[PDB]
């Protein structure tokens, strides 16, 4: 069937990274959840997990505040109103490299 590619979530994969090794516990009770509700967990195979930045750092200085979500729920937050989650500063696909960090294993 037909699939829209987000504008957003397809940067996942090019986004700086974070090791799961900042209060990220996975699911798999003390479970950090996402920003727009639910555990958080890098096994779950629906979920994009990112932490969002308060600020942002140019596309390769590695992380030096963040919030920790599915970026696929904040890309259809944003598809709706272009800002930031928190401090309502301007988030859209030009940006997001810049705040969102990809966590991994």
Do not use: W
């Not at 829209?4 to 479970?31: E, M, W, Y």
């Not at 950090?32 to 930045?53: K, M, R, Y």
């Not at 599915?70 to 259809?76: E, G, R, S």
């Amino acid at each position: 069937k037909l699939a829209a590619l987000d504008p957003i979530a397809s940067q996942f994969s090019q986004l700086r990274t974070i090791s799961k090794a900042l209060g990220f516990k996975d699911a798999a009770d003390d479970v950090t959840h996402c920003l727009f509700g639910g555990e958080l967990s890098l096994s779950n195979p629906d979920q994009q997990v990112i932490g969002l930045a308060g600020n942002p750092t140019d596309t390769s200085q590695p992380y030096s505040d963040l919030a920790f979500m599915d970026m696929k729920k904040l890309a259809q937050f944003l598809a709706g109103k272009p800002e930031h989650p928190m401090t309502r500063e301007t988030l859209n696909a030009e940006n997001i490299a810049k705040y969102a960090f990809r966590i991994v294993p």
